[PDB]
Amino acid sequence: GNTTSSVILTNYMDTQYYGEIGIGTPPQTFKVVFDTGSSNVWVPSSKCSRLYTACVYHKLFDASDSSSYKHNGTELTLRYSTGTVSGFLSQDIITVGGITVTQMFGEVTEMPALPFMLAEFDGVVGMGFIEQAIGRVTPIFDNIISQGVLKEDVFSFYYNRDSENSQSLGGQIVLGGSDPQHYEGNFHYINLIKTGVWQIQMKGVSVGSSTLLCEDGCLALVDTGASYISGSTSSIEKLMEALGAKKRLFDYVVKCNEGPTLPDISFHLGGKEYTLTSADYVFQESYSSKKLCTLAIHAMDIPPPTGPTWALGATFIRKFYTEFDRRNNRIGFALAR
Numbered sequence: 001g002n003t004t005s006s007v008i009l010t011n012y013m014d015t016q017y018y019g020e021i022g023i024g025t026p027p028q029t030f031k032v033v034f035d036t037g038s039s040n041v042w043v044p045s046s047k048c049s050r051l052y053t054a055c056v057y058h059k060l061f062d063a064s065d066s067s068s069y070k071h072n073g074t075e076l077t078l079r080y081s082t083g084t085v086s087g088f089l090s091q092d093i094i095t096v097g098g099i100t101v102t103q104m105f106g107e108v109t110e111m112p113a114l115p116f117m118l119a120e121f122d123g124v125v126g127m128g129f130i131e132q133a134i135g136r137v138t139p140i141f142d143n144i145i146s147q148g149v150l151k152e153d154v155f156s157f158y159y160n161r162d163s164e165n166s167q168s169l170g171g172q173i174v175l176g177g178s179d180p181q182h183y184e185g186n187f188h189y190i191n192l193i194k195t196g197v198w199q200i201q202m203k204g205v206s207v208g209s210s211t212l213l214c215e216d217g218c219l220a221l222v223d224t225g226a227s228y229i230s231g232s233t234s235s236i237e238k239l240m241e242a243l244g245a246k247k248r249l250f251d252y253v254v255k256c257n258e259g260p261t262l263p264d265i266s267f268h269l270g271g272k273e274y275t276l277t278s279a280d281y282v283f284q285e286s287y288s289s290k291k292l293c294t295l296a297i298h299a300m301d302i303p304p305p306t307g308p309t310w311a312l313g314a315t316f317i318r319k320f321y322t323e324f325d326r327r328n329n330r331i332g333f334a335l336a337r
């Protein structure tokens with residue numbers, strides 16, 4: 001094809017980057033996360049019981065008001081690291097930044113308050129492969145590819161650092177290419193181990209001088225939907241000990257005064273070193289000794305086949321403009337701007 005389509009994203013507190021999609025005729029609009037760590041499209045359904053408070057706060061899809069709706073009704077359960085959703089399959093017309101696709105998506109009827117009440121987004125757009133799609137439903141990007149409209153069989157992610165300003169731009173996804181306005185230098189491509197998962201080989205994690213972890217290799221899933229960089233509980237508990245961070249219920253803290261003194265964290269990928277400074281991974285809300293600052297790193301035990309793995313989420317993507325190459329089954333990284 002000849003076309004490139006861009007989706008503008010909203011940056012919510014550096015943890016959620018969401019765009020807009022339209023479903024049905026006339027379009028019903030939803031705030032969605034474009035997730036490379038999953039392959040299914042879902043939105044909350046009007047058929048969701050209002051005893052799920054998450055369904056009371058989010059925008060619901062009503063099939064009754066869509067003229068393009070095609071019923072299916074097959075049940076589906078989508079299990080994620082942070083929680084689970086259930087619903088049934090439905091078919092309709094989806095609009096993603098100028099591209100219109102006939103897509104099979106989940107109408108969510110069971111949506112727990114934890115974590116979904118914390119979500120600013122209503123639904124999810126899975127950017128993974130059909131190999132990871134629950135119910136073997138064709139993912140949205142495969143359907144866009146089938147239209148033969150895109151210049152390249154690629155998609156890119158730009159996540160902005162700045163969240164507290166307007167006119168700034170929260171982020172951007174480019175379908176069919178990369179925006180050279182948002183990166184500098186050249187892409188360094190790392191090939192995927194196998195097709196089916198946006199996962200690459202990682203050959204070490206360095207805290208300061210020493211390569212404290214992942215010597216003899218480990219895995220790294222490049223997940224656009226993950227707020228933070230994650231590792232296994234054992235890798236994390238070890239990394240956090242090295243930094244001097246204190247384990248809480250869910251997230252790790254450090255004394256705000258100690259934040260800028262923290263050592264650099266480096267990730268060995270495709271023979272290159274991808275380094276994060278303490279400015280990149282500490283939520284530096286203050287410098288007070290009497291205050292605690294959160295780190296944009298946490299533990300996540302991802303079960304097999306995918307895991308155990310590290311996950312390079314928004315924390316990593318903010319520093320490195322990421323290109324997802326479906327044609328050559330590789331991931332490209334470049335310094336973001």
Ligand SMILES: Cc1c(F)cccc1Cc1c(C(=O)N2CCNCC2)c2c(C)c(O)ccc2n1-c1ccccc1
Binds near residue numbers: 227
């Ligand atoms: C963001 C997201 C998604 F895109 C698809 C499915 C589930 C989630 C929820 C969700 C996460 C999640 O389970 N996944 C798995 C599939 N790929 C995306 C990340 C998640 C992860 C793993 C984190 O390390 C940190 C926050 C997370 N949020 C989260 C963020 C903000 C508020 C509440 C939760």
Ligand SMILES: *[C@@H]1O[C@H](CO)[C@@H](O)[C@H](O)[C@H]1NC(C)=O
Binds near residue numbers: 072
């Ligand atoms: C739902 O869609 C799938 C497409 O893979 C089809 O094989 C199945 O029979 C459908 N069920 C209904 C009730 O339309």
